[PDB]
Amino acid sequence: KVFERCELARTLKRLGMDGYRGISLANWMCLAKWESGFNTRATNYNAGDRSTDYGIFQINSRYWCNDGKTPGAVNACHLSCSALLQDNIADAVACAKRVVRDPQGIRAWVAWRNRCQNRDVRQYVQGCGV
Ligand SMILES: [Cl-]
Ligand SMILES: [Cl-]
Ligand code: NA
Predict the structure, then answer these.
(1) Among candidate residues 107, 92, 74, the one with its CA nearest the CA of residue 36
(2) CATH of residue 53
(3) H helices within 19-89, ranges in order?
(4) Cα–Cα distance between 91 and 71 in angstroms, integer?
(5) How far apart are CA 114 and CA 82, in angstroms?
(6) How many structural domains comprise the chain?
(7) Which site among 12, 30, 71, 113 is 20 to 30 Å from 37 CA-CA?
(8) C-alpha of residue 40 to centroid of ligand 1, in Å
(9) Which residues are annotated as catalytic?
(10) What's the CA gap between 42 and 58, in Å, rounded?
């Protein structure tokens, strides 16, 4: 599914993402935008280390979910990477919450640093009613 901006914004709020571990909803929107373009079925294979990024938040198979083909990987979210390709983002959100529970927080995604950190992220939620 390819979510529309405000539809996604309202969905994330309802799922308790606003201010989770100190991360504002606009930061999560900025992240989903640059990682997948709000697309839940986006997958990206990293030739360099044999891992794959899955879903709307582009969660990596080496640490967070199990796809069975990534060498020396773990499954911290205790999920099949398949769960991160659903139209229903409940599992993807629970896994994203797990990711930011680690010390790096939102910084775990390099994309956030490059395009969201120290920027005016208000634009991603303006007019959405959240
Ligand atoms: Cl699963
Ligand atoms: Cl599994
Ligand atoms: Na894994």
Answers:
(1) 92
(2) 1.10.530.10
(3) 25-36
(4) 23
(5) 28
(6) 1
(7) 71
(8) 15
(9) 35, 53
(10) 7
